[PDB]
From a paper:
The sealing of breaks in the phosphodiester backbone of double-stranded DNA is essential for the replication and survival of all organisms. This function is carried out by DNA ligases in a three-step reaction in which the enzyme first self-adenylates, followed by DNA binding and transfer of AMP to the 5′-phosphate terminus of the DNA nick, which is then activated for nucleophilic attack by the apposing 3′-OH group. Here, we report the biochemical and structural characterization of a bacterial ADL present in the partially sequenced genome of the psychrotolerant Psychromonas sp. strain SP041 isolated from Svalbard, Norway.
AMP bound in the active site was clear in the observed electron density, covalently linked to Lys25 via a phosphoamide bond to the side-chain Nζ atom, which is consistent with exposure of the protein to high levels of ATP during purification. As in other ligase–adenylate structures, the AMP is in the anti conformation, with the adenine nucleotide base stacked between the hydrophobic side chains of Phe97 in motif IIIa and Met155 in motif IV. Nine sulfate molecules were also resolved in the electron density, one of which is located in the active site of chain A. A sulfate ion at the equivalent position in ChlV-Lig–AMP occupies the binding site of the nicked 5′ DNA in ChlV-Lig–DNA, a structure which is also likely to be the case here.
Residue numbers in the entry: 0 to 257
């Protein structure tokens, strides 16, 4: 089937006015688009949602996450992949909504409509993701910590004045504590001081063609036995610094030896 006409998120940017954004918990589920009569996956597959699961839903199109609870991704994914419209396991799933993709008004009014839709439907299977205002970035990062320590995935931000767009949107942003990506180890940088005779850092070249140093994230065993040159490794970072270098980059682990 054709992929559904959905809005996609960009990455958090430091220089926003956080007071203009609604903040919600980023849920680790399976995205579904409700077109008014069926649920559709990001790839265009029609989910075999049982009749009793969707029976109460309004015909307003809705965007949401099929989700059970924090840290139950494989469970919800396993159910949603099952081709069986009489599968009782859907009873533990909630369609957690976060937008109205056919709406032509601002996100603030869309939230108000969603609250009404959820309340009127009054079904265990349809619920609204909480949307809150946060006063400043320090408070936002404190909230991020609360959510992550509680085994949540992160936060999402959506500008109160945003109009729905069927593409990546700068008005919709993901905020996680960090990002991971891959790079190839190309050289060693011998250490000094406590790391004399050991690994000080590696030089890697990432998939965007940027070469940079990684000196943190190594165990003491890894400073004695470094990743092989040529290996594909995963590094962790958040945002970019000058010259498109991943910021606060640290070593995670080896993926492939070349
Ligand atoms: P991650 O990088 O896995 O991105 C999360 C995706 O799921 C959708 N999503 C989850 N939770 C929400 C909220 N609260 N609001 C909006 N969208 C959500 C996002 O589109 C991401 O694609």
């Amino acid at each position: 089937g054709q992929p559904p006409p959905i809005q996609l998120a960009t990455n958090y940017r430091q220089d926003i006015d956080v007071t203009q954004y609604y903040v919600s918990e980023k849920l680790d589920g399976i995205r579904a688009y409700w077109n008014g009569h069926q649920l559709i996956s990001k790839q265009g597959n029609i989910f075999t949602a049982p009749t009793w699961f969707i029976a109460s839903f309004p015909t307003t199109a809705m965007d949401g996450e099929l989700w059970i609870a924090r840290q139950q991704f494989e469970t919800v994914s396993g159910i949603a992949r099952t081709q069986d419209n009489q599968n009782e396991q859907w009873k533990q799933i909630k369609f957690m909504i976060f937008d109205l993709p056919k709406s032509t008004v601002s996100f603030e009014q869309r939230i108000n409509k969603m609250q009404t839709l959820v309340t009127d439907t009054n079904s265990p299977y349809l619920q609204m993701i909480e949307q809150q205002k946060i006063p400043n970035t320090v408070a936002l990062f404190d909230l991020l910590n609360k959510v992550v320590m509680g085994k949540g995935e992160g936060l999402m931000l959506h500008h109160q004045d945003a109009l729905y767009q069927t593409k990546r949107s700068r008005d919709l942003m993901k905020l996680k504590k960090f990002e991971d990506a891959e790079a190839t180890v190309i050289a060693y940088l011998p250490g000094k001081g406590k790391y004399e005779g050991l690994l000080g850092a590696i030089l890697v070249k990432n998939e965007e063609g940027v070469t940079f140093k990684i000196g943190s994230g190594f165990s003491d065993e890894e400073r004695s036995t470094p990743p092989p040159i040529g290996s594909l490794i995963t590094y962790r970072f958040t945002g970019k610094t000058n010259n498109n270098i991943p910021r606060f980059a640290s070593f995670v682990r080896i993926r492939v030896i070349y």
